[PDB]
Symmetry: C3
């Protein structure tokens, strides 16, 4: 019953990591995740970003991939859950053999929960 | 491309149109039960969809035993961009229930000025 | 990660870069046609996703259609895409 739906939902959800987990890593300084802001918009358009995030535009990821450490775990995020740069960056990383996840809720969710940002 | 159409068909089968939900709540068909799966704090503003049952996503699996199996459930979070709707949907479908996520979520519903439980008197 | 890579690959194939579309709207090539399927982008043809399954016969097959979802959702564009692709049309959703 609803086998196809369940299969897609399970694979789909496995792409993400909960913001609570990301939040605890920074508040405990456990060094578990490296947060990448993969939006392609200019800095003047982005305005703010998740606290401690690294600007790694999806369009340059391939070229700057050598900058990332293979032994770490990456979390990518875009404007919203509907934008596709999060998934695009995730695909590049997973395809490259990197351990990565997309931030559930994206930047929109983070801001909605009044979580830490920076300019 | 069969793979594209295949994905689109399955992905869309997860959602239900607001028009379908609206028509049902105005014709008294009683075919759908709306579940507000937003986090508890957000639901304090009492801005839920008309007739929606307050059921925080993190409590769904626990309170799913209070639901009528003959009804079709429609879940929604404050916005469609989150994964709370799909996570709730997975719980319901895995339990043998018929459910769908509301297209547009709460933001979209309000955006269309659709019926909310509490309104001007 | 095979299942993840597979899903992501098919999912992303549904979309087209705004850069490619924009350039075409200036390149004087005019091979892309933008459809606003809301039930604004200048030059876009207003065609509701609900009426698409009836007006789609007013489309030139030699053109690639790009569905634009103003609300930035993930279902409106897909509804329109499903209709267009099933009809044999080449189409993508504007990312
Ligand atoms: Br962007």
């Amino acid at each position: 019953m609803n086998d196809k739906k369940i299969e897609l939902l399970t694979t789909y959800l496995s792409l993400y990591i909960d913001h609570h987990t990301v939040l605890a890593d920074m508040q405990n300084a456990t060094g578990k995740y490296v947060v990448l802001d993969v939006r392609n918009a200019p800095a003047q358009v982005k305005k703010d970003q998740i606290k401690g995030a690294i600007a790694m535009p999806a369009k340059d990821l391939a070229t700057r991939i050598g900058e990332l450490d293979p032994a770490k775990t990456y979390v990518v995020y875009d404007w919203t859950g509907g934008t596709t740069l999060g998934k695009t960056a995730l695909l590049v990383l997973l395809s490259a053999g990197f351990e990565a996840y997309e931030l559930a809720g994206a930047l929109e969710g983070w801001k909605g929960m009044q979580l830490p940002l920076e300019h």
